[PDB]
Design a binder for this molecule. Sequence first.
Ligand code: NAP
Ligand code: NAP
Ligand code: 12T
Ligand code: NA
Lengths: 359, 357
Amino acid sequence: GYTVAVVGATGAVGAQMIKMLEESTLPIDKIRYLASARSAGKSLKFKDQDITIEETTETAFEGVDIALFSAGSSTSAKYAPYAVKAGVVVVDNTSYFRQNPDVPLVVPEVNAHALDAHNGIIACPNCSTIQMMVALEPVRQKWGLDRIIVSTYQAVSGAGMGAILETQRELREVLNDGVKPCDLHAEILPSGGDKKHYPIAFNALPQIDVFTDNDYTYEEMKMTKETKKIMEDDSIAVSATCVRIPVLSAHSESVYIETKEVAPIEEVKAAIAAFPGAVLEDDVAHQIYPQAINAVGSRDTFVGRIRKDLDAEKGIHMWVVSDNLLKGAAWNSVQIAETLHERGLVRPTAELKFELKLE
Amino acid sequence: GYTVAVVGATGAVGAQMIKMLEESTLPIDKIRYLASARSAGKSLKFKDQDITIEETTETAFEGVDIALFSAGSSTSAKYAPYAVKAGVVVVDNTSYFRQNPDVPLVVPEVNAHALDAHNGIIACPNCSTIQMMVALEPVRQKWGLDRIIVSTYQAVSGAGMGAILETQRELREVLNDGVKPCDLHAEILPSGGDKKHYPIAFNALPQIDVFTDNDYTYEEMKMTKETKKIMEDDSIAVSATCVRIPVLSAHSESVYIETKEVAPIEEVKAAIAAFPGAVLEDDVAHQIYPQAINAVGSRDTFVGRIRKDLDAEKGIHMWVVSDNLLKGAAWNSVQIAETLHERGLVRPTAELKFELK
Ligand SMILES: NC(=O)c1ccc[n+]([C@@H]2O[C@H](COP(=O)([O-])OP(=O)(O)OC[C@H]3O[C@@H](n4cnc5c(N)ncnc54)[C@H](OP(=O)(O)O)[C@@H]3O)[C@@H](O)[C@H]2O)c1
Ligand SMILES: NC(=O)c1ccc[n+]([C@@H]2O[C@H](COP(=O)([O-])OP(=O)(O)OC[C@H]3O[C@@H](n4cnc5c(N)ncnc54)[C@H](OP(=O)(O)O)[C@@H]3O)[C@@H](O)[C@H]2O)c1
Ligand SMILES: Nc1cc(C(=O)O)ccc1C(=O)O
Ligand code: NA
């Protein structure tokens, strides 16, 4: 079996990494939980076992076979290259390594083939990108993709445990204390790192991550760039609007595509139904469509409201929902580790291709 | 001055109709509040005066100059034609008369000219359409519009007083009693009249109104058909996805357009800023963009996140927010009434074009 380390074990994604590993088929001989100095020495369960949390350091990875990182980009930048140097295979949930040509950016149902040539780091894409890829890959395979326009409806757990707590607190102040949403004080959302913070309670914030120099946010540009890499087609036009709404878990997306060939809607429904990891929930006569509250706790990606554009011959609209902590993060990561195991790819990488940041 | 009647005075829109009338310049000599039989006899304020609510009937409109209807499509279908026969000018918030070619479908900043030929009924468009029209008209004027794709983020007050209470109760049950959202009981949302009801707490429901034959909902199809009528151009391609989210007041919209000619983004921002009823809130360097919570209580429509598409030469994205009970309903109606006053259009219609009953 394997020694598996979870880096960022105490966070929103980490708690789901634990759950997904507890439910995994991976043969695990030893579990280690790593986080910051803040959590070092505390205890968390793995099944019935008590695991002492360790501070993440450059020397923490000896004997580790697989390390799952979900502790922020700076933590992956600082420590994943040392883990690789030590002989680990890293599955990274952060954005840091996603666009590195030496790093596979993987959704196992879409581009598992990319895992074979890994160099010790496999990156999980952005949560909003992953579920979109599950929905759209079966369509691309049969009718091609020319462009995508997507507007997202993103849950706050996307921004971490602090953001969940902020949202719950804000809602309680409004609903129990009678505070006006405009009078709420926020510390984290829309973006922990940015300069100004706004209430999410009873609001919709059209900012996820920070702004880039083209006036799209980093979240929007990640959807664009990650789609192109995952589908191995730079010619797919993708523009996004990413919005935070008052949902704790599960992202929803209004997705418009134009295909290369006309894709009959009944065939599109069938293709998605048949695609691993995607579930068709589309029966408007009985008001059946994906819903965030129904998707929570499931590894599947749910697709419905599928219909042709009213004017563009090759245009199709749909609604895509998945638990952003599961398929959008921890489940994609554990699924990657399981796929690495299936393919005999859990072993050290001889040549280091990633800069060491702590020399 | 005028005798003004508010039909549906007790509802979500009705309450805001009262507020907009209280704050109006309209010369009002007499105000009357009308609702259903179960509200008759109750008292409701107009400024400091106490107004006794009356039951809406076929005979209730004698001596009324202007009637603002916000009491459900059934109530407008039933009583609006009797109001017209009685010499009233009706401004209707319902969907009932919107697609009747004898009825102007008006956003005053966009198509006030359509008021001149009214036949006693003027229809207010759907809330989600109105704010989109305010944002897009200044762009259309300068560079034209080829197509629109919109995804909405609609507040629960759009579905009436009951939907607000249901939303608040559901959120309390989750936050205070630890109920899982998927286990909540719902009676109204997504659509009061439809067969099944779902929780909105911590959810996003991609259904507003009921489904039509083409698998778009009536709300989505209204955005399509109403846009074409208001902008007087059936060639504009419009497809919508309309979604309810856990917001009490103010609708937000992610709007994509392609113009007929390339519209430089700085000029687009300037054109929107200069357009009556639209306010530019777009300064990403300081994280400035329209927000539902900031728009509540304002008659203005706020536009930001304006940026060109990453690939389509003529494509532009933006974010549009307005209070759905104000510009989306009660303010659009009162603004129509003020515009009718300005234009000398508050008078009986000689020829009746609307079937009684
Ligand atoms: N949430 C999502 O839907 C989502 C989806 C895809 C990807 N991701 C990515 O996954 C990562 C984790 O996000 P989250 O939502 O789980 O955040 P979170 O709840 O705020 O948790 C952050 C975690 O990072 C750890 N950490 C912080 N600084 C550290 C350091 N210097 N060394 C080691 N550990 C450190 C924290 O440990 P302490 O408790 O000791 O502070 C905690 O375990 C982020 O990079 C995020 O971009 C998140
Ligand atoms: N809410 C919005 O953002 C929005 C936007 C645009 C248009 N609209 C339209 O405006 C209308 C009202 O919506 P709302 O949200 O204000 O609904 P609401 O809160 O449920 O209020 C319904 C109102 O209609 C009255 N009513 C019901 N049946 C009646 C009858 N038979 N005769 C006279 N009055 C009757 C009710 O009076 P009682 O109290 O006596 O029952 C109440 O005043 C609807 O047609 C809706 O489509 C709403
Ligand atoms: N800003 C984010 C970035 C990522 C990522 O790229 O890992 C995941 C979630 C969020 C969020 O805040 O919802
Ligand atoms: Na203006």
